Structure 1
């Protein structure tokens, strides 16, 4: 199978910047008719991927001139001469020259900004959930930048990892920050075995700590 290597996978940019994405083919993608079916797609969130460039350098209908494709053999490049607010999303390269037809892993074109520490909020289980015999402890690590932040749970001085469910949001369109939710899933009985519940935002010292006592 033809493997497509996209370089880089994450492209941090400022509006107005010149951007370049590379697509490296594991083998030649020249079809038996001499044509190279190398395509570039842009996927915005919620939307389906939309064609930008096909046959290496042909711009699709409605595609601006700031988007251009080039390359030969195993190295293909998508260039964005001026990054606009509407150009943000995930870029994919695709080859249709050999079966199976294949895509690259996707390049996230993301907005740069200054580092931001998260806002940590901890929530004891609700009385409504306790009545059902369940006790979920929820923590939010909101509006941080870049993705370099983690969660750490401590229950009465001991690190907790089992029963922890984490989810990260995409880059926020409001301020270019990321957010994450961490839920410690316990039964009412498990929750009653412990007193002090601690949620921390960690970095590669210094953590942002939130806690409550049962």
Structure 2
């Protein structure tokens, strides 16, 4: 019994309804009249949360904006009046027979207005320096869409060697995206230069939001 869902939903406007499809290779409708399909939610950095079970029973705590309908083989999770906090990955699954099987999950995409990244660069801490290490960090927070590049310039030169980037999931309250960029290097190398620039080229303005020290 394989359950299949798409990896991403179409972008949804806050306040409007979202639909998440799911399909099973076998009918989940049991002779007792119950359809053994359940949905759970996985938010950024939290434990899975049951949403709906037996096709149309809400789990306590789950607001009635959530609902599920479908035949025995094709189902739809519906979320009306989508709120920013609804972001996350929705999984369908079946508990009709062994072995238990699960969908691959559908990430709810929330659409919103373009936003610029609030950049903030930081030089190696004194502590890290006393330990011989020297990493320069700069954040590019609360931007939209999640598309961006980031570029480092050491003393006016392009350095992409020891750079590591990390992106967060869509914010559950802001619907924006944030990213972290860290250029790690030896203290000896760090002192070998004086200027460090953090460049953030977002798909807006055409002009990069640079920051350096």
- TM-score (norm. length: structure 1): 0.78
**SS, match of residue 150 in structure 1:** coil
Q: Which residue in 1 is equivalent to 2:52?
A: 53
Q: Cα deviations across residues 124-177 of structure 1 (Å, max 9, x unaligned)? A: 222332222111111111221221123222334543333222223344456433
Q: Which residue in 1 is equivalent to 2:26?
A: 28
Contact 1:4 1:102 (8 Å CA) reproduced = no
Aligned equivalents of 2:80, 2:121: Cα separation in 1: 45
- Structure 2: gaps spanning 5 or more residues: none
Aligned equivalents of 2:197, 2:121: Cα separation in 1: 8
Q: Which residue in 2 is equivalent to 1:4?
A: 4
Taking structure 1 as reference, are residues 110 and 198 closer, same or farther at Cα in structure 2, changes over 3 Å only?
same
Q: Which residue in 1 is equivalent to 2:153?
A: 154
Contact 2:120 2:139 (8 Å CA) reproduced = yes
Question: CA RMSD for the aligned pairs?
Answer: 3.1
| 1:131 equivalent in alignment to 2:130 | yes
Aligned equivalents of 2:150, 2:38: Cα separation in 1: 39
Count, aligned residues: 210
| 1:208 equivalent in alignment to 2:209 | yes
- Structure 1: gaps spanning 5 or more residues: none
Q: Which residue in 1 is equivalent to 2:177?
A: 178
Specify which structure has the higher proportion of strand.
1
- TM-score (norm. length: structure 2): 0.78
